[PDB]
Each structure stands twice: as structure tokens, then as C-alpha cells.
């Protein structure tokens, strides 16, 4: 009983928590791996994605060797604060949370060899730059970079516990994505230089592809159908001036409502997204069709029903054809 | 060996008072800084503030901590900062800021053999940047970040940009959604009061707003609608049903564009450049419908192709002139 108590007390006697193990003697080596409980939601407005991890870390400290009937200990969180631990921080974590409900979600295991094992549970809002030119047919690779903050390359080196591919595990329930689809993750490590010195950075990229089914029904189909709706007015007789005029103008008012709502879903940007061009082209066809009727109306001598105007015959073919051509160029470009 | 380094640290910290600046009564303790920006986001015109994350660093020399016999640069644990003296540097126009704490409180303390101390932080601050949006969206905002000592004067402390013009890095790598950083400047000057000069360092960007979004969303819809309202002038005045229906729907359409753009655009309750254009277009569609009302009355009430004919040129001419005045003035 009291034997275990005595072992813990002797460990901190003379141990210094301000000096990394093997200071001025060798390079402290930290072996780490990540378990992803749930890849959190991805926000386009803030361009940041949440993630919950079980962040593990292993390293060897020669100052914590001990001998006794036990082999592996499980220190209290109070004692875990008196032991040097790597200052791992996330290079793009905008606002991360270390849960401590109902107790600090930390676990410090020490072996008689001195090979500390250190796991914790985190929620991270890592930032993710995005290029939304091909909206909504794009595909990003949101990264995750963590490395030491104070210790340079010549002091602390980070390595993955196993092969880098198998050192990040994603739970099958991990995907909390409504609009994206986690294809896979890429794991690699690199070197960064800054104002203070070199560092070792462990990078993980989570590939994401945006689902497109929502936009086709919400925006692409109504826009395509509305343009067809306007182009159908060319089959009305040229003498129905009050009809085609109301037909032509109200279609513009319809497309205006569609364009406005569609951009509300699209996050606030400044460049020209792929969807904005499609809406703009539709907006041009609807405008073009109405102008066509004005040209026809300027040559209608008799207001009572003459034959079909030659412009009407040509517009029945040219207008549906050009829009049909535009769809090929639009979809082939962004789906190859 | 390693225990000797423990002795060296214990030598420095023992007898060290955190309430005394280096060279307490002598010359001022110069402090050099070099921000290292990471990202910028949340540039909100609604609150006139922006948020940036930086690896803020401060260099200064303290002869009370110099060590000998160790050719290395000691990198002590970040918790040692509670046992040293650090400048009381604060940002003068921050609304909310904090030091990231995951997985440990992000800061570094590095002691060099000559006593020089480097004290870095990873700070994310929501600095306030007052904006003048009278030319929005053709605007050019200038946002700053004022850095100043709190309770010391230039008799005791002196800030300076370490590394000169290269003190601030990572500016160009930033990618704002709807802006384009043009340039940044570094200012090192003393704010002079009655008591004495207060050192101050200013970092200032020059944001410029992109226009591609509003061309395809505000200006193009309003120009296309206005051109449609001119179609009424090529339809016979006797077409009471067609011309009135065409004219009034555009007036409704412009109202739909204005109101829905207002909800999309940020709430900035004073007159901007976009409002003048939208209101400018609204008058042109209003006059087009009002033009027919004068044509119909003269033919019927006072009964005349000239008025429609003369309007076929003036309305395109005037609206083109309105754009020529508008774009030149706002560009």
C-alpha cells in the first residue's frame, strides 16, 4: 500500500520541470499519433473546420526511472503538471479546447524504463484556406499542422509512432460533414524556418470534396428551367403583345429572385465563383429573349391575328441551341 | 553536466526581483520587437474591426541573467515567464485578445549567454479599425495596430522595430476573402504628453476591396433592368396593357434588387456609393413608367409619336452620362 506512495514521492526529488530530458546532451525525440473521434463540421464562412482528437505522445526521459513491484504508473493530473512535457501546439488552430469535464482529460503513464506515454482529448478549430473559384464543384485539402513552439529542430524532433499512413486513425463515425465527403487523409512531416530558428512540423491533410446534389435541385434546375420558360415564348403568336411582354418581364423577375437566393448560400467572397457565371449567363439569356421580342414587335404592321416573323423562326432554334451549347462547355470544364 | 545547467538556472533566478526593470536606475532598457503574422480574418465593416493571429516577439537585454561556460542558448519551459521581468506591452486598439493555450500556453523564453532574453507569444487580437465607407465598395481601408507600453515612459523603456523594415513578416502570404493587402508600414515614434514621451510602435496595412463580386451581383442586374425599362419606348402608346405591365414590373424588380441586396450587404446606416447607384437606377425606371403616363394622357386626355421618339435617345444618353459621372468620381 504505502510502497506505491513512496515510489511517487522519490520521482520528483531533484527532478526539474524547466529542462527537457537530455538537455545539452542529445535530441529529445517525441513519437506521436492521433486518433480522430469525429471530423467536425467544416464552415465555409469562417473557412475553418472543427475536429476532435485523442492526441497521443511518447518520449523517453531518463530522470524518471524507477524499480518496484509495479511496472507502469498512472499519475494524478496534479503530478502530471510537475513533469516536463512537450509544448506541442497547432500551427493553424484558431481556437482549441482541452476538455476537462468532469476531470482533466489527460493521462500520463510512466514505465520503469522511463518511456512516458501521454494522451489527451482535444477539440481543434484548425483554419483551412479555400479556393472557391469552382464552387460548388471544388475539392479542398484542409490541413492540420502541429509542432513544438519553444524548442527548435536541434532540441525536439517529432516522429510518427508507426508508418505515417497508419499513424492517424479515423473512426468510421468520424465524418460529421453535411456538404463535404472525407475521401482520405495524407500524413507527412516537414521542416519550417522562422524568425527564431528551424522547427519540425508534422502535417496531416484531410481531403474534402463538396457534394453537388443540393445545388442542382436548388439552383441549377430552376435556372435551367426558367431560361427554357422564357425561350418558350417564341412559339406565341407575334400579335399577343400584352402576353409576351408580361411573359418576358416576369421571367426576368423570376431569375432575379433565383440569383439572389443562390448567392445567399454561397459564402461572402469577391472573386467570380463558377456558379455566379452560370447564373449570369442565365440572366443574359432571359434578358436577351425579351429584347428579341422588342425587335419583332417593331415590324408587326397589323395588331390582329400575318405569318410567323423570320426572327421568331430563327430565335426558336438559335436560343435553345446556344444555351444547350453553353451547358456542355460549362459542365465539361468543371467536371473533368 | 546536466545538473550543472540546473545549477546555472538556479543561480540566475535566485535573488532575481520581478519588480525591477533591467538597469533600474540607469539608461532605458531598449526593447526590440518583430511580429510574425499568421492569418487575418473577420474584417467586419459592421463593427469596424479585424482579427489577426501573430507570433508576437520581444527582444531585450538583461545583464542580471547572463551565464558563462555554456555555449548554447537555453530554452526554458514557458512556465518560467512568471519568474522573470517582461515589458508591460499592450495593444492600444484591441477589443478582445488572448494567448492560445492548447496544448500548453503558447510562449517561449530563451536566454542567451550575454543575458539577452527573447519572449515570444502567440496572440490573437480583435483590433478595432475605423472605416470610411462613403466610397464602398470602391473603398481603400487603412487598418492599424497600435503598440504601447502601459506604465513606463521613454525615460525608462524604448521600443524599436528589430530588423528594420523586415521586422514584420508573413504579410504577403495572407489571403483575405474580399480584400487585397497592398502594403504595410512600420512607425516608430514617441507620443508626447505633459509628463513625458510614451514610446509607441504602429503596424498599419492598406486594405483594398475587390469589385468582382458586386459587378455580377449589383451593377449588372441594375443595368440590365434599366435597359429593359427602355423597351417601353419602342411599343405603341396604344398598348396600354403591355407598356404599363412592362414598366411597373421593372420598378418592382428594382425594388426587389435593392431590398435583397440591403440584407446581403452589411448594415452600415449612412449613405454609400452603392446606394447612390441603386437609387440612381431606381429613378430611371420610375421616370420611364412616368414617361408613358404623359404620353397616354396627351394622346387621349388632350387628344404624338415625338415624345416617345425623343425619349428613345434621351434615356439611353442620360443613363450613359450618369454612369460616366459616377465611375469617374468614384474611381
Amino acid at each position: 500500500t504505502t510502497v506505491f506512495t513512496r515510489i511517487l514521492d522519490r520521482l520528483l526529488d531533484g527532478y526539474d520541470n524547466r529542462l527537457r530530458p537530455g538537455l545539452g546532451e542529445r535530441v529529445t525525440e517525441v513519437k506521436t499519433d492521433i486518433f480522430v473521434t469525429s471530423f467536425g463540421p467544416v464552415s465555409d464562412h469562417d473557412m475553418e473546420y472543427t475536429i476532435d482528437v485523442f492526441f497521443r505522445q511518447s518520449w523517453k526521459d531518463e530522470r524518471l526511472k524507477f524499480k518496484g513491484p509495479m511496472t507502469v504508473l498512472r499519475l494524478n493530473n496534479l503530478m502530471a503538471s510537475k513533469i516536463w512535457t512537450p509544448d506541442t501546439f497547432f500551427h493553424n488552430g484558431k481556437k482549441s479546447v482541452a476538455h476537462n469535464m468532469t476531470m482533466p482529460n489527460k493521462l500520463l503513464r510512466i514505465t520503469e524504463d522511463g518511456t512516458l506515454l501521454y494522451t489527451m482529448r482535444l477539440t481543434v478549430r484548425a483554419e483551412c484556406p479555400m479556393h472557391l473559384e469552382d464552387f460548388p464543384m471544388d475539392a479542398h485539402a484542409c490541413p492540420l499542422k502541429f509542432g513544438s513552439y519553444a524548442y527548435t529542430r536541434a532540441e525536439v524532433v517529432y516522429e510518427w509512432t508507426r508508418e505515417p499512413a497508419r499513424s492517424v486513425v479515423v473512426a468510421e463515425d468520424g465524418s460529421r460533414l453535411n456538404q463535404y465527403d472525407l475521401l482520405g487523409q495524407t500524413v507527412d512531416s516537414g521542416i519550417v524556418q522562422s524568425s527564431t530558428g528551424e522547427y519540425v512540423v508534422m502535417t496531416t491533410h484531410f481531403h474534402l470534396k463538396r457534394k453537388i446534389g443540393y445545388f442542382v435541385i436548388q439552383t441549377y434546375l430552376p435556372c435551367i428551367m426558367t431560361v427554357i420558360l422564357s425561350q418558350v415564348s417564341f412559339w406565341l403568336n407575334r400579335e399577343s403583345v400584352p402576353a409576351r411582354t408580361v411573359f418576358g418581364v416576369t421571367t426576368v423577375l423570376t431569375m432575379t429572385t433565383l440569383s439572389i437566393s443562390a448567392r445567399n448560400s454561397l459564402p461572402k467572397v469577391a472573386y467570380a465563383t463558377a456558379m455566379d457565371w452560370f447564373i449570369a449567363v442565365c440572366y443574359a439569356f432571359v434578358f436577351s429573349a425579351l429584347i428579341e421580342f422588342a425587335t419583332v414587335n417593331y415590324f408587326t404592321k397589323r395588331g390582329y391575328a400575318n405569318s410567323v416573323s423570320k426572327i421568331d423562326r430563327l430565335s426558336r432554334i438559335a436560343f435553345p441551341l446556344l444555351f444547350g451549347i453553353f451547358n456542355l462547355v460549362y459542365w465539361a470544364t468543371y467536371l473533368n | 553536466n546536466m545538473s550543472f545547467v540546473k545549477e546555472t538556472v538556479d543561480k540566475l533566478l535566485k535573488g532575481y526581483d520581478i519588480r525591477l526593470r533591467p538597469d533600474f536606475g540607469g539608461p532605458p532598457v531598449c526593447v526590440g520587437m518583430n511580429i510574425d503574422i499568421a492569418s487575418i480574418d473577420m474584417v467586419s465593416e459592421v463593427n469596424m474591426d479585424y482579427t489577426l493571429t501573430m507570433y508576437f516577439q520581444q527582444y531585450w537585454r538583461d545583464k542580471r541573467l547572463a551565464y558563462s561556460g555554456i555555449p548554447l542558448n537555453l530554452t526554458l519551459d514557458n512556465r518560467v515567464a512568471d519568474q522573470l521581468w517582461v515589458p508591460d506591452t499592450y495593444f492600444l486598439n484591441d477589443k478582445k485578445s488572448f494567448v492560445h493555450g492548447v496544448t500548453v500556453k503558447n510562449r517561449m523564453i530563451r536566454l542567451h549567454p550575454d543575458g539577452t532574453v527573447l519572449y515570444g507569444l502567440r496572440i490573437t487580437t480583435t483590433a478595432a479599425c475605423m472605416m470610411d465607407l462613403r466610397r464602398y465598395p470602391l473603398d481603400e481601408q487603412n487598418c492599424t495596430l497600435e503598440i504601447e507600453s502601459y506604465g513606463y515612459t521613454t525615460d525608462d523603456i524604448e521600443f524599436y522595430w528589430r530588423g528594420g523594415d523586415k521586422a514584420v513578416t508573413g504579410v504577403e502570404r495572407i489571403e483575405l476573402p474580399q480584400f487585397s493587402i497592398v502594403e504595410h508600414r512600420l512607425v516608430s515614434r514617441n507620443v508626447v504628453f505633459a509628463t513625458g514621451a510614451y514610446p509607441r510602435l504602429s503596424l498599419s496595412f492598406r486594405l483594398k476591396r475587390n469589385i468582382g463580386y458586386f459587378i455580377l451581383q449589383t451593377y449588372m442586374p441594375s443595368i440590365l433592368i434599366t435597359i429593359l425599362s427602355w423597351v417601353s419606348f419602342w411599343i405603341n402608346y396604344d398598348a396600354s396593357a403591355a407598356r404599363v405591365a412592362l414598366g411597373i414590373t421593372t420598378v418592382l424588380t428594382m425594388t426587389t434588387i435593392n431590398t435583397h441586396l440591403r440584407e446581403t450587404l452589411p448594415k452600415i446606416p449612412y449613405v454609400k456609393a452603392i446606394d447612390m447607384y441603386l437609387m440612381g437606377c431606381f429613378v430611371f425606371v420610375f421616370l420611364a413608367l412616368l414617361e408613358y403616363a404623359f404620353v397616354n394622357y396627351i394622346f387621349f386626355g388632350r387628344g404624338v409619336n415625338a415624345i416617345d421618339r425623343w425619349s428613345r435617345i434621351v434615356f439611353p444618353f442620360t443613363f450613359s452620362l450618369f454612369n460616366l459621372v459616377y465611375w469617374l468620381y468614384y474611381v
Partner: nanobody
Framework: SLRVSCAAS????????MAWFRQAPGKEREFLAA???????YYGDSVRGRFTISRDYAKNSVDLQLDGLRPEDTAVYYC?????????????????WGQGTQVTVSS
């Protein structure tokens, strides 16, 4: 001691990975280096510690440094840019590709 640059025009790669590649004659295409927005430098284990990669973000150009040259390094070097989808060490991940420059090494 050879410094090879890669100037990019017609596109802004401020937030794109301006990587590097080497193509041996008839053998294969091999990864050399990369540098994303956050200045993170990646290197190939074959020539790790021999080649230095630097990007001038202002000029939108990536400069590759060749040190410790060997006769085995005589191949056409290619500069590629992209988002690195499905990993940044795969050639297909980069949209834009450079013309390429051939360097002859003899000893």
C-alpha cells in the same frame, strides 16, 4: 552549387503549393521538394539534406537550390504548382506544370 528558380506568371499562387519535380530519362517522375502557404518545406528522402527550396511569395516564384551534385542527378527538372489533392507528393495532384529545364552533371 546550382540555384534554379521558377517564376510564375498569369496566376497568383499565394495559397498554392509551388513544388518541384525531377524526371529522369525514361525511368520515372520523382518528388523533390514543396512549400505550401505556411512555409512548410518538404523534401524527398532520396536527396534529403542536399536540395534547398525557397519561395518569394512577393514575386510568386519558387527557387530550388542544388547542392552536392552527383552524376545521377542529370535529369530534366520540372516546377509544378497545385493544391496537392490526394497528397502533395503525387504528380497528378498539381494542375499547372512548368516547361522544365535540363541540367547536365559530369564528374
Amino acid at each position: 552549387s546550382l540555384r534554379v528558380s521558377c517564376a510564375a506568371s498569369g496566376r497568383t499562387f499565394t495559397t498554392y503549393i509551388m513544388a518541384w519535380f525531377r524526371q529522369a530519362p525514361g525511368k520515372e517522375r520523382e518528388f523533390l521538394a514543396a512549400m505550401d502557404q505556411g512555409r512548410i518545406q518538404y523534401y524527398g528522402d532520396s536527396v534529403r539534406g542536399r536540395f534547398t527550396i525557397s519561395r518569394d511569395y512577393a514575386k510568386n516564384s519558387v527557387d530550388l537550390q542544388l547542392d552536392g551534385l552527383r552524376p545521377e542527378d542529370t535529369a530534366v527538372y520540372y516546377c509544378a504548382a497545385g493544391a496537392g489533392f490526394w497528397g502533395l507528393r503525387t504528380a497528378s495532384s498539381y494542375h499547372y506544370w512548368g516547361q522544365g529545364t535540363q541540367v547536365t552533371v559530369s564528374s
